[PDB]
Amino acid sequence: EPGLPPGPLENSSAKLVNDEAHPWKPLRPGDIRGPCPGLNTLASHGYLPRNGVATPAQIINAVQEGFNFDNQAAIFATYAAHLVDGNLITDLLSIGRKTRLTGPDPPPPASVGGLNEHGTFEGDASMTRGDAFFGNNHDFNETLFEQLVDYSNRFGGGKYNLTVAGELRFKRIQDSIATNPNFSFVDFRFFTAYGETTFPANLFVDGRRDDGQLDMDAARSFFQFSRMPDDFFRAPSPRSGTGVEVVVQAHPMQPGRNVGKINSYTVDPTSSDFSTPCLMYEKFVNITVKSLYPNPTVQLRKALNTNLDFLFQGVAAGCTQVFPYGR
C-alpha cells in the first residue's frame, strides 16, 4: 500500500521543466500551499496534484523530475515529513494546512497537520515565512522577502548566493532570538534551517547557468507565486544542500532555544548538531515520531515500520537503523 521510494532519475540532464505538460496555474478554491516554495511550485505546475495533497512517491518523483533534487535527500525529507505530518494509512500528505483530504485521522497525540504543523518539520527562522509565534508560519511574507533582497544587494551583488545565505541565515536567527520568546533551534530544525538556505542557489538557478547566483525576479516568482520563470531549465545534475558548509562557516551556531523570554538563548547539550548527524536521525525516530505514535494499533504499527524503513534509505551511510516498534 505505501509505494516503494522512487529511484534516481534515469536521465538527470538539464532540460526545460516549465513545459507544455506542466503549465503554471493559479490556485482554485481548496488548493493547498504551504511553507516550502519547492513543493508549492511543483503543485502549481502540476508536477504534484494541484490541490497540494500527495503521496510520498509523488513528492519524490516531482522534486527529482522538476528540480533535480537528489534521491537520498528526496527520500529522507519526504519520509520524515510524512511520518510526522502525513497520514500513514492513506499514504497522503498535505504540503500546507491540515485537511480532511488526507483521510480519517489516527488517534491523538498524532496531529497529521500537514507541512504547516509547527515543530514537527516546519520551524523558526525561515527566510520568507514568519515564525509560528507571530501568527503565520506558511504564507509568503513581503517584509521578509524584501530583507532577502536587501541581503542579496549587500552580499551577492544583487543576487542570492551562498554568501548571502550565510548572512541571512544568521540575521533570521538573531531576529528570532530578539523577538520570539518561544524560539526553538534544535535537532531536526537546526539541520534543515541551514540546508534550506542553499536550495535557492542550487535549485532555483536555471540549469543552463548553474552558477549559484539567483536573480530576484526568479526568486520572487518561486517564493511568492510558486511559479517557474518562463523557459526555466532545471539543474544539470542531482543535488540538494551542497555548499551548506559555507552557510555554517559564516556564523557557526550551537543548537538551543529561548527559554520563555526574548534574548534568553540557551544552548541544549542534548541536541544533535553537525558533529552528530546519526543522533539527529535517532532522536527524530525515537522521540519525535514515537511521541506522535506511542502505542499504535496493528495497521498503524505496520505503516510506521514501512515508512521508517524508507526513511532509513535516505539516512547517510554509517548510521545504524533504530527500531522503535521492534523488528
Ligand X SMILES: COc1cccc(OC)c1O
Q: Which residues are annotated as a binding site for heme?
A: 36
Return the one option of Cl ion, ligand HEM, ligand X, none that residue 35 interacts with (CB less than 5 to 8 A, by type).
Answer: ligand HEM
Return the one option of ligand HEM, Cl ion, ligand X, none that residue 165 interacts with (CB less than 5 to 8 A, by type).
Answer: none
Residue 266 in contact with ligand NAG, rule: CB under 6 A: no
Residue 144 in contact with ligand NAG, rule: CB under 6 A: yes
SS3 of residue 311 by DSSP: helix
Return the one option of ligand X, ligand NAG, Mg ion, none that residue 241 interacts with (CB less than 5 to 8 A, by type).
Answer: ligand X
Q: Output the residue with the shortest Cβ distance to ligand NAG.
A: 157
Residue 141 in contact with ligand NAG, rule: CB under 6 A: yes
Task: Please give the residues from 103 up to 142 whose contact with Mg ion meets the rule CB under 5 A.
Answer: 122, 126, 129, 137
Nearest-angstrom CA–CA distance, 194 and 202? 13
What is the closest distance, in whole angstroms, from the C-beta atom of residue 159 to ligand NAG in the complex?
6
The alpha-helical segments, DSSP class H, found in the chain are 37-44, 56-67, 71-85, 142-155, 162-179, 187-203, 216-223, 244-250, 277-283, 290-292, 298-313
Size of interface with ligand HEM, in residues (CB under 6 A): 26
Nearest-angstrom CA–CA distance, 26 and 186? 36
Spell out, one character per residue from 200 to 219, where the chain touches ligand HEM: x when CB under 6 A holds, - when not: x--x----------------
Question: Angle formed by the axes of helices 56-67 and 71-85, to 10°?
Answer: 140
- In the complex with ligand HEM, which residue's Cβ is closer, 251 or 323? 251
How buried is residue 321: exposed, middle or buried, by Cβ count under 10 Å (0-12/13-18/19+)? middle
The DSSP secondary-structure symbol of 224 reads T
Residue with cell 491540515: 98
With CB under 5 A as the contact rule, which of the stretches 38-46, 89-97, 177-185, 232-240 interacts with Cl ion? 232-240
Residue 78 in contact with ligand NAG, rule: CB under 6 A: no
Size of interface with Cl ion, in residues (CB under 5 A): 4
Enumerate the β-bridge partners of residue 184: 257
Closest CA to 119 of 184, 60, 72: 184
Return the one option of ligand X, Mg ion, ligand NAG, none that residue 182 interacts with (CB less than 5 to 8 A, by type).
Answer: ligand NAG
Backbone dihedral region for residue 77 (phi beyond 0: left; psi -120 to 50: alpha; all else: beta): alpha
What is the closest distance, in whole angstroms, from the C-beta atom of residue 193 to ligand HEM in the complex?
7
Residue 113 in contact with ligand NAG, rule: CB under 6 A: no
Residue 282 in contact with ligand NAG, rule: CB under 6 A: yes
What is the closest distance, in whole angstroms, from the C-beta atom of residue 199 to ligand X in the complex?
7
With CB under 6 A as the contact rule, which of the stretches 17-25, 94-102, 227-235, 316-324 interacts with ligand NAG? 316-324
Residue 212 in contact with ligand NAG, rule: CB under 6 A: yes
Chain positions contacting ligand X, by CB under 6 A: 73, 77, 192, 195-196, 240-241
Residue with cell 521543466: 17
Task: Please give the residues from 124 up to 183 whose contact with ligand HEM meets the rule CB under 6 A.
Answer: 126-129
Nearest-angstrom CA–CA distance, 66 and 42? 7
User: DSSP per residue over 39-93, as a string?
Assistant: HHHHHHTTSS-TTSEE-HHHHHHHHHHHH-B-HHHHHHHHHHHHHHHSBTTTTBE
Residues 116 and 137 sit within 8 Å (Cβ to Cβ): yes
Return the one option of ligand NAG, ligand X, ligand HEM, none that residue 69 interacts with (CB less than 5 to 8 A, by type).
Answer: ligand HEM
What is the number of other CB atoms lying within 10 angstroms of the CB of residue 273? 19
Binding site for Mg ion (CB under 5 A): 122, 126, 129, 137
